[PDB]
């Protein structure tokens, strides 16, 4: 009786949200960006090849200096690369080799990683001893760790496969806030530029926007037909893009509270593993299961170019903070750095 | 045209490769096994004979280091993280023979044996295990023999038309699982009969992994 009545009210609320989104859907992003000229053909060459990973690479993250980056592979090795010289600055042996994510602290003093071991390990990069040591192990998630991102040296947000996201106090080792509401495994998260909000994508084909300080879900974005594997904030923080197993990439807007554009092609039938934006946001780079990395025009939903230099699934990619270069990681155990030429 | 400190950084990087190579080769000669199987399927009994989220167990048998990974605590969707094990030497699959006349605790209408058969073909025919040999364990062999006399196998398999004895009913179930192999060319299924007091459970995995190692060597050497 009471349960039946309540679940009917939920359907009415869902219809109210759908009607509200339809009310503000006066125009289409495709119509708005029809007049602007296309980016043309985007040709990028492999300037550097980072060798040394001996297994599938699952994650990489640039440092804030736009020169150092950290990558994680399932050979049980965390490697920090000097992209200018291809020198390896550090090699961090991971206690658990089944790593799925890695993060570079904005200060550059810490890195984080975690996978099927349900643990977020914090590594100190600036020690008087000259070696990287574990400073914290963040326990509390009941599923695998899918993504993690530092806000500063003391706060980090992690998404897990136990359907929850958490905000951690690194000094005390306790999760100050727990973000609940996803009905599937959360696969990725992206921090807003001001680090006051973050979005997460789960396997329930939905993306939720979370308030870091308040600790509740502000908005939920649906529209995908399969599990969401990747998510990335737009450089201004007012939008984010996702990549799913349905061979589509979608750009969601926070303020419009609905999907704006889908990035898919009929030839593409493989899942998407990673997404990132260029500094201006004009290019959306997505890694695919078909061994390629496609650079998309975010505004016009056109495939601007292809990075084809890997013999297995492109599992991760990232764009520098200054926009100078893009790194792509793949299951073929190689990292490649791309940029154009005059 | 490198400065005196840039050249020293390069020498540091080559010292890291000297240690990546040392660790990468040590990991290449070790055996990675994915331990799969359902609730009360004997999965934990096998671990009891070979002594967070994922439970990794190491053991040494005849100068060979095995890494057996138990993912029973991962309640998430299997298809998401299963690709992380693409490249394991073999998969150890535990099936309870006695769970043929029983039904699932939750469903209360789906047979336990049919659940494993659906689980087996979801793993055997998985795209990441295309050329990954599977070690199929048929546990509780002794308890199955007692239960055949009372409960006939026709409850689980209507198409069965055979003798009510262990030596014929068990072989029918054994070939039913091996029949689920949708690609009998790129992979093999190794089937073994364990028990609660057996001492040949680790030997079978050692033998089955050895045949997988030979197969992998032939591909690398170009003979295959």
């Amino acid at each position: 009786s009471e349960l039946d009545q309540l679940r009917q009210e939920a359907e009415q609320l869902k219809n109210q949200i759908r009607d509200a989104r339809k009310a503000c859907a006066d125009a289409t992003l495709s119509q708005i960006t029809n007049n602007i000229d296309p980016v043309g053909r985007i040709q990028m060459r492999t300037r550097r090849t980072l060798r040394g990973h001996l297994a599938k690479i699952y994650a990489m993250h640039w440092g804030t200096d736009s020169r150092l980056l950290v990558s994680a592979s399932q050979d049980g090795k965390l490697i920090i690369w000097d992209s200018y010289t291809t020198n390896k600055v550090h090699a961090i042996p991971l206690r658990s080799s089944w790593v799925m994510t890695c993060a570079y602290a904005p200060s550059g003093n810490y890195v984080a990683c975690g996978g099927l071991d349900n643990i977020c390990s914090i590594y100190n990069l600036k020690t008087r001893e000259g070696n990287v040591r574990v400073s914290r192990e963040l326990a509390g998630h009941t599923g695998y760790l899918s993504c993690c991102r530092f806000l500063d040296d003391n706060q980090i947000v992690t998404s897990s496969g136990d359907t929850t996201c958490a905000l951690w106090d690194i000094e005390t080792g306790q999760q100050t806030t727990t973000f609940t509401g996803h009905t599937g495994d959360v696969m990725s998260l992206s921090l807003a530029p001001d680090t006051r909000l973050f979005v997460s994508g789960a396997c329930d084909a939905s993306a939720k926007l979370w308030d870091v300080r308040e600790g509740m879900c502000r908005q939920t974005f649906t529209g995908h037909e399969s599990d969401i594997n990747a998510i990335c904030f737009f450089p201004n923080g007012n939008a984010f893009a996702t990549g799913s197993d349905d061979a589509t990439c979608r750009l969601f807007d926070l303020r419009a509270d609905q999907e704006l554009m889908t990035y898919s092609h009929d030839n593409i039938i493989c899942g998407i593993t990673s997404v990132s934006f260029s500094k201006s946001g004009r290019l959306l780079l997505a890694g695919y299961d078909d061994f390629n990395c496609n650079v998309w025009d975010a505004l016009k939903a056109d495939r601007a170019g292809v990075l084809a230099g890997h013999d297995n699934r492109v599992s991760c990619l990232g764009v520098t903070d200054d926009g100078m270069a893009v790194a792509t990681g793949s299951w073929d155990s190689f990292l490649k750095i791309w940029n154009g030429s005059s | 045209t490198l400065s005196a400190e840039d050249k020293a950084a390069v020498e540091r990087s080559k010292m890291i490769d000297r240690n990546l190579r040392e660790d990468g080769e040590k990991a290449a000669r070790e055996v990675k096994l994915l331990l799969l199987g359902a609730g009360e399927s004997g999965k934990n009994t096998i671990v009891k004979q070979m002594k967070t989220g994922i439970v990794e167990t190491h053991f040494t048998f005849k100068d060979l280091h095995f890494k057996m990974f138990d993912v029973g605590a991962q309640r998430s969707e299997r298809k998401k993280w299963i690709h992380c094990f693409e490249g394991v030497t073999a998969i150890i699959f535990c099936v309870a023979l006695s769970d043929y006349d029983l039904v699932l605790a939750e469903d209360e209408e789906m047979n336990r044996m049919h659940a494993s058969m659906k689980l087996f073909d979801s793993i055997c025919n998985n795209k990441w295990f295309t050329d990954t040999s599977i070690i199929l364990f048929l546990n509780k062999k002794d308890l199955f023999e007692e239960k055949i006399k009372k409960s006939p196998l026709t409850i689980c398999y209507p198409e069965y038309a055979g003798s009510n004895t262990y030596e014929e009913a068990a072989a029918y179930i054994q070939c039913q699982f091996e029949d689920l192999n949708k690609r009998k060319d790129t992979k093999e299924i190794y089937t073994h009969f364990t028990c609660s007091t057996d001492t040949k459970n680790v030997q079978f995995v050692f033998d089955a992994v050895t045949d997988v190692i030979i197969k992998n060597n032939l591909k690398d050497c170009g003979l295959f």
Partner: single-chain antibody
Amino acid sequence: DVQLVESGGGLVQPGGSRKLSCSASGFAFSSFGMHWVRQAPEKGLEWVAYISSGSGTIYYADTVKGRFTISRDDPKNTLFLQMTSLRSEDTAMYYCVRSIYYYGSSPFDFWGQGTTLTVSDIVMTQATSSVPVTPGESVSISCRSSKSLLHSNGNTYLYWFLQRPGQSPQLLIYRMSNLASGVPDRFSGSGSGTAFTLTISRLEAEDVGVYYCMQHLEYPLTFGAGTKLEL
């Protein structure tokens, strides 16, 4: 804590041999390159030898090349300097200096206490030998180099050290602008080409001492004469 204890020094006959040891504790010794720097009595610092991380690269000063041998024992975390045919010119305090090399590292950040030995090329110029100073007043120290220290990679390999009376040298500024760990923010390094300035705002009693500028653009590493601050 990070420690570097030197031993083996003492009074030796001319033409003799002596073995200097540098024991390292509290840090990853095998990950750090090591330098020997000596200081003659009432004189400035003088670089002796260098061994790289992994022992692949070894450098010697011209005045000691062929007579001195530098070696390390990674399992024992000990650094060695084998000296032979010791002359009266070798009477000095020998300092053990650690230096690690990667992007953004701070070489020469920690120095040892030094050991005393008694026996019975880019030119770095610090013309101003002494500067009378008072606490709380701003002081600028100038350094000159015969060659331009700016490399094509954008780095300017100039280092500043402070040796307080009775104490080991301490790193202040590395690569001509960066501030070393544990050094107060009042120190600031500014320079261009061959002329460099070290600005010390709100000078304090601890800042009193001799300041040395060293170049790391190329080997051999050469030191300036040194600028002394006195009250």
